[PDB]
């Protein structure tokens, strides 16, 4: 029952803060085949190893993908204290984890290209007492609150985003800022893999 990886091969991959999630759950996968459609630049794991990640059988397998510039390689790792894991995308620290940076080659042509790389570089709430700023740090497996006020791709590098919240939503302001990195000749992406094992139900084995 092949895992459907094709939707990754078709269309413009989102920016990092709109990371696209694929959840596979009862199928056979050939990961070391998918990666063979790309030029893998970095492949870093955590509680697993690139060899094992492709080999083992899981109860669940999560694949996040997004446009992401090679030039920001240091901002995408478990250990990074940067703005990416702070405001855009943080994966779980308690499930074994992987992090691939790859480039789509001239070979593969069905992946359209955003206008540039964006990422949220600050994201805060201005509480309604008018004098408190509370940084909205992204939780694992979730989106930043600021996804609602930031465009699919940041227009220009300094762009500042400000939104007033209804007393329902807490009642302050939700404020954000985005940064851009110029588009590269061939598109460069980041893939996050997240696996879950046990408890008797590891049916995402490979083919």
């Amino acid at each position: 029952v092949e895992c459907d990886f094709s939707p990754l091969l078709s269309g413009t991959p989102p920016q990092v803060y709109n990371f696209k999630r694929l959840v596979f759950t009862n199928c056979n996968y050939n990961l070391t085949k998918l990666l063979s459609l790309f030029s893998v630049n970095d492949f870093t794991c955590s509680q697993i190893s690139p060899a094992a990640i492709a080999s083992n059988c899981y109860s669940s397998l999560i694949l996040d993908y997004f446009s992401y510039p090679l030039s920001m390689k240091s901002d995408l790792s478990v250990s990074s204290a940067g703005p990416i894991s702070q405001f855009n995308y943080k994966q779980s620290f308690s499930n074994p984890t992987c992090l691939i940076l790859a480039t789509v080659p001239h070979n593969l042509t069905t992946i359209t290209k955003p206008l540039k790389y964006s990422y949220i570089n600050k994201c805060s709430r201005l509480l309604s007492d008018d004098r408190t700023e509370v940084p909205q740090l992204v939780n694992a497996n979730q989106y930043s609150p600021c996804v609602s006020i930031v465009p699919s791709t940041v227009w220009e590098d300094g762009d500042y985003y400000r939104k007033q919240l209804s007393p329902l939503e807490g009642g302050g302001w939700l404020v954000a800022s985005g940064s851009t990195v110029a588009m590269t000749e061939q598109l460069q992406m980041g893939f996050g893999i997240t696996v879950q094992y046990g408890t008797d139900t590891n049916s995402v084995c490979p083919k």
Epitope: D157, G158, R162
Partner: antibody, heavy 120, light 107 residues
């Protein structure tokens, strides 16, 4: 807050025009400034923005490389330089400003407009 | 470009009616959509920013709703001065507008 367009009129195809927008009640380069056009009897089409503080530009597909959006910190004015003008470029050109200091996208403030006819 | 598809192109209703104009984007635009009113011979007036946010100084009989790819403007309790063309505009990518909806008042 007022927006006063000017500089339009009849121009021959192939020709040029520098439309100008005199702004007051606020200061450009704090806001995203835009140009919007409207052919006679037809609907609206965005043609260019010059970003806020720092002035980065961008254009519509139909006008890219021909039109050029500029600006001047003193005289508080906004320009649209339209070259190699086409019959199809005939429209009322609106000078429009971002709703807020920060990036907004939409516009409360439009100018009255200026008509640009293109024909022999 | 992103294509905004607006409907109906033209519509007629008597005073007091509810009217609903519809806009569809060819991709998710996340509540980044405005509605404008253009009264015969003038610049457009801003009605709704956000997907649902009422710009101050427009009567509360205007209301916007929707998110993702499907949006409605809803004037409910139509009044004689609401005669105009209504445009929608997405600002999630370089701006694009709906084709237009003319609102005629029965009488």
């Amino acid at each position: 807050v007022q927006l006063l367009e000017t500089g339009g009129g009849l121009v021959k195809p192939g020709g040029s025009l520098r439309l100008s927008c005199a702004a007051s009640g606020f200061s450009l380069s704090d806001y995203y400034m835009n140009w919007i056009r409207q052919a006679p009897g037809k609907g609206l089409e965005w043609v260019a923005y010059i970003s806020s503080s720092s002035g980065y530009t961008n254009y519509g597909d139909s006008v890219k490389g021909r039109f050029t959006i500029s600006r001047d910190h003193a005289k508080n004015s906004l320009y649209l330089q339209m070259n190699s003008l086409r019959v199809e470029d005939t429209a009322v050109y609106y000078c429009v400003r971002d709703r807020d200091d920060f990036w907004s996208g939409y516009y409360k403030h439009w100018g009255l407009g200026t008509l640009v006819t293109v024909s022999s | 470009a992103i294509r905004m598809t607006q409907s109906p192109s033209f519509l007629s209703a008597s005073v007091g009616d509810r009217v609903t104009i519809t806009c569809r984007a060819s991709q998710d635009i996340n509540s980044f959509l405005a509605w404008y009113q253009q009264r015969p011979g003038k610049a457009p007036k801003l009605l709704i920013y956000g997907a649902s946010n009422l710009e101050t100084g427009v009567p509360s009989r205007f209301s916007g709703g929707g998110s993702g790819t499907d949006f409605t403007l809803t004037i409910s309790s139509l009044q004689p001065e609401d005669i105009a063309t209504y445009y929608c505009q997405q600002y999630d990518k370089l701006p694009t507008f709906g084709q237009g909806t003319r609102l005629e008042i029965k009488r």
